[PDB]
């Protein structure tokens, strides 16, 4: 199973989202910017899902950990100017959980292209 850590603030949207994502993969689940950075030193996921709730992009991106793991961007209703860059992919909340399940796969999809590469 592919690991995929969520970080989100809120309890209500963290486990919803762990609760769709159970399935498919084995999912951590992350409250904040100390916790996933922890998480990553543990477990060393192979997605990062980061709400914007809690630039933790950058953060996250100048750890030596993520090196080749994407990481998607959720926020709520500045972006396109240009605020909080450095993720892979961003949706707006809230989301298709078919869409997000899809573009999870091919970030996925991708990332064992280049390893198999």
């Known amino acids: 199973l592919k690991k995929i850590l969520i970080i989100d603030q809120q309890d209500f949207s963290r486990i919803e989202l762990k609760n769709f ?22 477990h060393h996921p192979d997605l990062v899902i980061l709400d914007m709730d809690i630039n933790l992009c950058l953060k996250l991106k100048r750890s030596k950990g993520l090196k080749n793991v994407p990481l998607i961007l959720l926020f709520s209703s500045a972006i396109v100017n240009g605020l909080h860059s450095g993720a892979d992919d961003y949706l707006t909340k809230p989301f298709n959980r078919n869409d997000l399940l899809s573009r999870i796969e091919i970030h996925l999809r991708t990332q064992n292209y280049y390893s198999d590469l």
């Open 21 to 42: 994502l159970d399935s498919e993969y084995l999912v951590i689940e992350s409250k904040n910017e100390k916790e996933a950075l922890e998480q990553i030193d543990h």
